Write a protein that binds this ligand. Structure first.
Ligand SMILES: [Zn+2]
Ligand SMILES: [Zn+2]
Lengths: 21, 196, 78, 145, 127, 173
């Protein structure tokens, strides 16, 4: 429940990525 | 169970098929191209055809076609009746009139069980593009039919004759079609069918 | 009056994933009834108009966008 | 006033009423049947329909839906006033029953040419004045206007 | 429409007694007012009605109608009965038509055997 | 980049299109649809070049040029403010609406007159959220043609949200 709702947004995840697409 | 029919493989690059659907793919199995379902035996194929699944896909394919844009028990003695063609004329053009006569209570004495007995003869305009022999074609026929007697045809080279314009005052009992109600008479008491 | 005597793909749209409530934030807070459809929104005229006219240039890096805000910092990263 | 027109309108209205109470007797034959049965025991001569018709609530081939008492009685009183109207009109009617004049009147008919107005309210207002469900917007009250 | 109505009903009033006054009026005046006299003009039909009606009033002039309540009721019942009958005829007709459609749809229009190549309304009656 | 091509004979095949357009420019990709129902070509294709320079070039030189199966080959190249206004007068013409809202802001399209309930209403498209705010501020609950009209945002729920000013500002930019 809390872990399922704890997830960061995919766009928040894009910034960590050198090849975000 | 195959009834001796030959179903060609899908890759053999298409003789008319009974159902142009069930095929055999590169492998030996049988498939329904529409349904995309594999079938082990011809019995399974027949279960597929008799199944509602395949039928639904057939209706969907017919809808795709539109998007892209009593018959059994019919008595038949095949007896040629006697027609009486005659060049007519009124006003303001020229039209044709046919007088078809029928039996004189000679053989109709054995069949009187109100089975479409009340139904009068029917006429339809058929294109010669389709015939049992399919040799020559290109003209129309004014076919006239009655249950027991044999069908009759009359060639109509002229593109249009007597094709009137709102003869009566738009009354809607379609019967069979505008043609029949518009210009036919059935003297049932004397058994004489007039058409013009 | 006139009762005289004489004498649709329900389970299919759930299976396919459609008719399910969803919303795109960047487009007019618009509603979409299927996830395949919203995944098709990523390549569209209006969606790319909102991006490009917003200053966030088109095509394939921004596909997973929903809200207008995050893709702004993403475009600053671009 | 040309009496011909008046007597005409009278016969026409009478026709309208007969047609109304006939439509009624049609939708629910009981209306007549009920009545007639009672009549039977007051004036012995009266001929009454086949029992089967009465029971199956039919007049010819179609058996009509059975109605509740309150409605049957209602419509019977409505038909009552209708028959009253009819009797009145019949009465007045009994008490009521050249070229130069033709052009003479046709000339005066030119009077008030600029009368922009649609007139579809003589037979419609009467037909309507005596028909089923004439009160509500569409279908709420069986009573005629 | 009061004008049209009035002229129709008036020419109908006169037309109901003589039929000669109107045929003279048409030739005397020459006005596009009575254009309903020809069966071409739609309204003509309704005209044929009114006149008939007036013709009817001339029927029992000098005779009173003495219908009683009982009778009026009986009559309305019989009218109802008639309507029911007519309704039944309509039904039957619809049925026969249906049969015809079925059979027409169900016969071989490819069983050809031709021989050669190339007012009924008053005829579809009896006399 | 990508060019539309049309008026194509289904007998024209993919290799024939490729060999045709390589004569004009280099062809990156060819999408040439195939009808699954009819098992035939539907008679129009899409040729994606390596750039809009060769694309537009092929549009200029190719259009109305090649004749394939006697049929000519065709080539063709491949979000605003909305105010709902209620209780308008029957004497209010759409052009009169145009005149009324021009002073407040430029209209991207023409007004849309429709009837609710009897009730004359219209949709007015402004190019600017701020000019729309002007027509709202001045024209809300006002009497024109002796009739009180109401001016607000049309529903999408209604326009004029916070993200709406932000993105409409950008579409203006
Ligand atoms: Zn199948
Ligand atoms: Zn979107």
């Amino acid at each position: 429940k809390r872990r399922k709702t704890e997830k960061p947004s995919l766009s928040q995840l894009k910034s960590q990525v050198p090849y975000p697409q | 169970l195959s009834k001796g029919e030959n179903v060609p493989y899908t890759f053999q690059d298409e003789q008319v098929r009974s159902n142009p659907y069930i095929y055999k793919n590169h492998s030996g199995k049988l498939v329904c191209k529409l349904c995309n379902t594999m079938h082990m035996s011809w019995s399974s194929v027949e279960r597929h055809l008799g199944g509602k699944k395949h039928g639904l896909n057939v209706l969907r394919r017919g809808i795709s076609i539109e998007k892209s844009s009593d018959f059994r028990q019919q008595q038949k003695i095949i007896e040629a009746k006697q027609s009486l063609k005659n060049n007519g004329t009124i006003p303001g053009s020229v039209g044709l009139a046919i007088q078809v006569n029928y039996s004189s209570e000679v053989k109709e004495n054995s069949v009187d069980s109100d089975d479409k007995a009340k139904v009068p003869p029917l006429i339809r305009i058929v294109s010669g593009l389709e015939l049992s022999d399919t040799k020559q074609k290109g003209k129309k026929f004014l076919v006239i039919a009655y249950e027991p007697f044999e069908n009759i045809a009359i060639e109509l080279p002229p593109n249009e004759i007597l094709f009137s314009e709102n003869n009566d005052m738009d009354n809607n009992n379609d019967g069979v079609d505008e043609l029949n109600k518009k210009c036919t008479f059935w003297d049932a008491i004397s058994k004489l069918y007039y058409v013009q | 009056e006139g009762a005289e005597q004489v004498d649709m793909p329900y389970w299919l749209y759930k299976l396919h994933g459609l008719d399910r409530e969803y919303r795109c934030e960047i487009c007019s807070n618009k509603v979409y009834n299927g996830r395949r459809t919203f995944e098709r929104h990523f390549n569209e005229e209006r969606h790319i108009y909102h991006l490009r006219c917003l200053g966030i240039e088109p095509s394939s890096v921004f596909k997973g966008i929903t809200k207008i805000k995050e893709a702004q910092e993403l475009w600053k990263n671009m | 006033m040309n009496l011909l027109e008046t007597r005409r309108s009278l016969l026409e209205e009478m026709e309208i009423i007969e047609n109304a109470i006939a439509e009624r007797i049609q939708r629910n034959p009981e209306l007549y049947y009920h009545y007639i049965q009672e009549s039977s025991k007051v004036f012995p001569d009266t001929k009454l329909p086949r029992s089967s018709l009465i029971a199956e609530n039919k007049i010819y081939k179609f058996k009509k839906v059975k109605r509740k008492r309150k409605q049957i009685i209602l419509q019977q009183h409505e038909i009552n006033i209708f028959l009253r109207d009819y009797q009145e009109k019949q009465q007045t009617f009994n008490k009521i029953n050249f070229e130069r004049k033709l052009q003479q009147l046709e000339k005066e008919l030119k009077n008030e040419d600029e009368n922009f107005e649609l007139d579809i309210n003589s037979k419609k207002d009467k037909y309507a004045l005596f028909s089923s469900s004439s009160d509500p917007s569409r279908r709420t009250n069986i009573l005629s206007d | 429409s009061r004008r049209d109505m009035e002229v129709i009903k008036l020419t109908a009033r006169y037309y109901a007694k003589d039929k000669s006054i109107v045929e003279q009026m048409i030739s005397k005046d020459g006005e596009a007012r009575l254009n309903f006299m020809n069966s071409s003009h739609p309204l003509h039909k309704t005209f044929t009605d009114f006149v008939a009606q007036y013709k009817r009033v001339y029927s029992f002039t000098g005779q009173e109608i003495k219908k009683s309540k009982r009778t009026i009721l009986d009559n309305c019942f019989e009218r109802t009965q008639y309507w029911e009958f007519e309704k039944d005829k309509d039904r039957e007709h619809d049925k026969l038509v249906e049969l015809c459609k079925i059979q027409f749809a169900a016969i071989p229009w490819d069983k050809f055997t031709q021989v050669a190549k190339f007012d009924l309304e008053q005829m579809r009656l009896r006399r | 980049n990508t060019v539309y091509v049309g008026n194509i004979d289904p007998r024209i095949t993919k290799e024939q299109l490729y060999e045709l357009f390589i004569q004009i420019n280099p062809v990156l990709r060819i999408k040439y649809p195939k009808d699954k129902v009819l098992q035939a070509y539907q008679g129009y294709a899409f040729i994606e070049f390596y750039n809009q320079g060769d694309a537009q070039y092929a549009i200029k030189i190719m259009n109305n040029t090649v004749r394939l199966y006697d049929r000519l080959i065709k080539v063709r190249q491949v979000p605003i403010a909305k105010l709902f206004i209620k209780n308008l007068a029957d004497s209010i013409d759409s052009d009169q609406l145009v005149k009324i809202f021009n002073k407040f802001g430029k209209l991207i399209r023409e007004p849309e007159i429709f009837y609710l309930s009897k009730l004359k209403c219209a949709y007015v498209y402004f190019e600017d959220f701020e000019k729309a705010d002007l027509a709202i501020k001045s024209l809300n609950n006002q009497l024109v043609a002796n009739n009180r009209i109401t001016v607000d945002y049309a529903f999408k729920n209604g326009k004029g949200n916070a993200k709406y000013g932000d993105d409409v500002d950008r579409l203006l930019n």
